[PDB]
Design the sequence.
């Protein structure tokens, strides 16, 4: 059933006026709160 | 088909021991089969 959701409004104009790129904002939000998959590594010989 | 003579044996690494441990185990097995010239003949690797 429906659940409460958090809506964060990003003002593009203010970000531009402060010299902050939109890509940086979106990447920061997604990585910090949603987790970002960067690349792989070898753990005991297996790719993870 | 291939040669279709003899046997094809694979020495798998089921514990994540690495390449060095696997090669050491293969060398040990070669040392073992060298003691039975009357049953096993021409046991050699198929790799570099």
Sequence:
């Amino acid at each position: 059933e429906d659940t409460p959701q958090f809506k964060i409004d990003i003002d593009q104009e203010k970000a531009q006026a402060l010299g902050v790129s939109i890509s940086d904002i979106n990447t920061t939000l997604g990585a910090a709160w949603g987790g970002s998959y960067v690349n792989d590594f070898i753990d005991r010989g297996r790719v993870k | 088909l291939g040669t279709a003579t003899g046997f094809d044996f694979e020495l798998i690494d089921q514990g994540g021991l690495g390449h060095e441990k696997l090669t050491q185990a293969r060398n040990q097995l070669f040392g073992m089969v060298a003691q039975h010239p009357d049953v096993l003949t021409g046991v050699r690797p198929n790799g570099l």
Q: What stands out?
A: DSSP finds one helix and no strands in chain B. Residues 37 and 43 of chain B are 10 Å apart (CA to CA).
